[PDB]
């Protein structure tokens, strides 16, 4: 009711109990995941995935597994806008990198363009 | 001392001041682990978050996914699910009786009804193969239907078990000193029964005529003849009586379910949710593709949140799903009758003594696995 409020940023790493080593050490990455190109389906777009950097993964000497001393290794954070993505990355204290979304460029194709008269565009095989 | 929980009881001499359960000694991370799996992967968490009920929680989660997914299970699978749900209610009530018996003393009917429970574990073994953690209930019907030579064994068990519960009522139940142990302990106001959120056998045992099977029949329970007992007084001798009568009504429901078994079908006829049978898998192409992607990715679910609850023998077993439109759940929570019953221990133990407090904890069907979520 028009109360106390100050206008400042947020530093939630004092609250969430995380080690400051894993705060100042690592660095987030915010990106739209590129389409797995062997498939052709663009539903895997329309997100904003936040990952962390990959780190040390040695081998289990007894079996031949993959062991790591990395607690923040296998997270991913699905967001829906870059604005609140960068806002959250600022808000929870860690540093971050911002890649940029690259759309499929629209084109101009026709079967009639494939079957021209003098133009060298000619499929010659179908 | 075995019961496993922490209890801090500050008291004036042998009576009371304030007793508080520190629970959280058992916390595992079930909700986070279901948040990192698929549905079909994370079904056994629902099998064992309550671990005594081994088919009721299966039934609850499968009805949660069917309710979110809008697929009716086939009728023969519904009757089989009803039969195993009532067997499981029988087993959980008879465990609660015998564990209160051994927690108070009363060494032998523990062993007697555990012989009966070994017979029912034999039935679970022949049906699924597990001893106790029989998953067996996919979303969308019953997987791998029951073999030949089972129903007459259920029939023989039903006759023998009616005689054995009569002999248990011969042993205890008008037993003088057990009644003298339990007369007027655990008073519950109906307003306290509502505001403290007690559910199931507490509400059955004190006041309100409230049963989920007869108020929202979630399956073919509307076709079987039975009656839930209502409790008269806020005490646990009466609540014991309503447990034993719910056992006998479960026997009636098992007899009618044996008499009303249709020879319909095993699973749903939806090969995008239930996996196809193995012969038509290894012949057909579409069946192989549906098997393969159904076990890798899992079935997609339309988004949204739902809540449902059924009768666990402890009470309103609620499962609350949050499903982003995906192959994974996004969140799940378990509204736990054990947690709700543990919530009101100050009102159930304000005016008694500590041995009677142990009797209060014992006479409510607690497991402290379901109290954890």
């Amino acid at each position: 009711t028009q109360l106390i409020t100050v206008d400042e940023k947020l530093d939630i790493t004092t609250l969430t109990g995380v080690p400051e080593e894993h705060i100042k050490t690592r660095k987030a990455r915010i990106f739209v995941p590129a389409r797995n190109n062997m498939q052709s389906g663009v539903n895997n777009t329309k997100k904003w995935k936040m990952e962390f950097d990959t780190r040390e993964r040695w081998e289990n000497p007894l079996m031949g597994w993959a062991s790591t001393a990395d607690p923040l290794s296998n997270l991913v954070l699905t967001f829906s806008t870059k604005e609140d993505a960068i806002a959250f990355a600022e808000k929870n204290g860690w540093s971050y990198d911002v890649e940029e979304r690259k759309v499929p460029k629209p084109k101009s194709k026709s079967y009639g363009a494939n079957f021209s008269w003098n133009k060298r565009t000619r499929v010659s095989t179908k | 001392h075995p019961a496993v929980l922490r209890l801090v009881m500050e008291l004036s001499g042998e009576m009371v001041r304030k007793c508080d359960p520190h629970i959280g000694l058992l916390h595992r991370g079930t909700e986070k682990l279901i948040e990192y799996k698929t549905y079909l992967q994370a079904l056994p968490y629902f099998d064992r978050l309550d671990y005594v009920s081994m088919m009721c929680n299966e039934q609850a989660y499968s009805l949660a996914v069917e309710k979110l997914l809008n697929i009716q299970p086939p009728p023969r699978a519904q009757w089989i699910r009803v039969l195993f749900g009532e067997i499981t209610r029988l087993l959980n009530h008879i465990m609660a009786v015998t564990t209160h018996a051994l927690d108070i003393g009363a060494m032998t009917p523990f062993f007697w009804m555990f012989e009966e429970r070994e017979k029912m574990f034999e039935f679970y073994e022949r049906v699924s193969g597990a001893r106790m953690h029989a998953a067996y209930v996919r979303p969308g019907g019953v997987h791998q239907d029951l073999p030949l030579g089972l129903m007459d064994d259920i029939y023989e068990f039903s006759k023998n078990f009616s005689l054995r519960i009569d002999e248990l009522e011969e042993m205890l139940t008008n037993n003088r000193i057990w009644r003298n142990r339990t007369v007027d302990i655990g008073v519950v106001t109906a307003e306290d029964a509502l505001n403290y959120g007690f559910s199931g056998v507490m509400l059955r045992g004190s006041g309100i005529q409230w049963d989920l099977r007869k108020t929202q029949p979630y399956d073919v329970y509307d076709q079987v003849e039975f009656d839930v007992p209502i409790g008269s007084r806020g005490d646990c001798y009466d609540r014991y009586l309503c447990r034993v009568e719910e056992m006998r009504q479960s026997i009636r429901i098992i007899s009618q379910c044996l008499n009303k078994m249709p020879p319909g079908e095993i699973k749903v006829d939806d090969a995008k949710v239930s996996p196809p049978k193995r012969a038509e898998m290894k012949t057909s192409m579409e069946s192989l593709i549906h098997h393969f992607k159904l076990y890798t990715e899992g079935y997609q679910v339309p988004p949204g949140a739902t809540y449902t609850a059924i009768e666990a023998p402890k009470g309103e077993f609620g499962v609350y799903l949050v499903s982003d439109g995906s192959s994974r759940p996004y969140r799940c929570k378990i509204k736990a009758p054990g947690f709700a019953h543990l919530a009101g221990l100050d009102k159930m133990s304000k005016g008694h003594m500590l041995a009677d407090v142990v009797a209060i904890i014992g006479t409510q069907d607690i497991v402290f696995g379901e109290v954890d979520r």
């Binding site: - | 073994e125 042993m171 003088r176 039975f226 009656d227 409790g231 009568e245 890798t296």
Partner: protein, 176 residues
């Protein structure tokens, strides 16, 4: 539809109240309880002599996690990783290479018998029934190293009995 209980009053007729008084001051139903317990005393016990008489089981019990091989042929496994894809504890570990013959095969096939919750999804998910839940129950191993089965452990394990597993599968290939 309900049946509420504790509807009797203590009857003020002299017969019922003197019967309850004689019940109180003569200790009657306690002796009735002793009679019921003696009735279970003179029965015959349901105790199987365990190391000789082994208990009854089912044709669909889930035990050993064995592998199988073809009749007069090599491993039934293909290494298509469906069992690691469905394994809810993620106990299966598969690393696959083909041999020089061209057929696809493995290198490494690990089961964490610690992590193994014994569902049966790997039995009911393999398209060829390569890995099969065994019949037995005896693992009972002293060292934590030795409950981590490798592929050759499973091959020497499933080749310890075939006709058992094949008999169970021939009994049980129609209900599933």
């Amino acid at each position: 539809t309900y049946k509420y209980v504790n509807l009797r009053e203590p009857s003020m007729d002299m017969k019922s109240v003197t019967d309850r008084a004689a019940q109180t001051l003569l200790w009657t139903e306690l002796i009735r309880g002793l009679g019921m317990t003696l009735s279970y005393l003179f029965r015959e016990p349901a105790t199987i002599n365990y190391p000789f008489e082994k208990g009854p089981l089912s044709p669909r019990f889930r035990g050993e996690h064995a592998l199988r091989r073809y009749p007069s042929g090599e491993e039934r496994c293909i290494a298509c990783k469906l069992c690691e894809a469905v394994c809810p504890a993620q106990a299966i570990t598969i690393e696959a290479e083909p041999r020089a013959d061209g057929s696809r095969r493995t290198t490494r096939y690990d089961i964490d018998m610690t992590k193994c919750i014994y569902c049966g999804f790997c039995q009911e998910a393999c398209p060829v029934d390569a890995i099969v839940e065994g019949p037995n129950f005896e693992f009972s191993t002293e060292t934590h190293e030795e409950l981590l089965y490798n592929k050759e452990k499973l091959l020497n394990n499933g080749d310890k009995w075939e006709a058992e597993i094949a008999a169970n599968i021939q009994a049980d290939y129609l209900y599933r």
